[PDB]
Design a protein around this ligand. Structure first.
Ligand code: NI
Length: 165
DNA sequence: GTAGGACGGATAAGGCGTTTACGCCGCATCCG
């Protein structure tokens, strides 16, 4: 049984980790499109800012900032996993709920954005963060945020990742 | 501050039915 309490703060920024139940799945990748589509549908109905996001074949990590006066990432995640569950007609694919962490300062924010873009490399998919197309890294390189050839240390602070067994 | 199917009580999908424009019921997934 879990014990965490959602940290709700209006206008807040947070980091999240949502895992597919099945380790060998590649569904988030294969059906990249339905996923993309789902987040779009929900974003429209309950506005938020995607600070950053990666999708891996079987889980994703991301950072959101919610509108002023709005603390409700819960609904937003509930709808997202719902649309995508609907769209691909598969049942019980998600690890229930999700990992949430409130970002209170700029340093922490950057560690978590980096963590996001480094992730494909930590997970062994690619040797270079720009090799992975399934993220906002390229969106961010396309403003003057990150050099396309960016690299960074692979770190291990606890972050909602599935247990490595 | 903190997971890994707590599980009862919530929200409120979209497919049904007609009033082909909304109401009814109450998904799949949330929280404490
Ligand atoms: Ni990861």
């Amino acid at each position: 049984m879990s014990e965490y309490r959602r940290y709700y703060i209006k206008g807040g920024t947070w980091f999240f980790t949502v895992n597919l139940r099945n380790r060998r799945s590649q569904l988030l990748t294969t059906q990249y499109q339905m996923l993309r589509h789902a987040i779009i549908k929900v974003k429209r109905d309950r506005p938020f800012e995607i600070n950053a996001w990666v999708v891996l074949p079987e889980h994703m990590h991301c950072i959101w900032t919610l509108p002023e006066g709005d603390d409700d990432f819960s609904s937003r995640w509930r709808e997202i996993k719902k649309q995508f569950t609907h769209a691909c007609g598969l049942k019980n694919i998600w690890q229930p709920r999700f990992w949430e962490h409130a970002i209170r300062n700029t340093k922490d924010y950057r560690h978590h954005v980096d963590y996001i873009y480094i992730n494909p490399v930590k997970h062994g998919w690619v040797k270079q963060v720009s090799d992975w197309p399934f993220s906002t890294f390229h969106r961010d390189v396309a403003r003057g945020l990150y050099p396309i050839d960016w690299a960074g240390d692979v770190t291990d602070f606890s972050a909602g990742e599935r247990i490595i067994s």
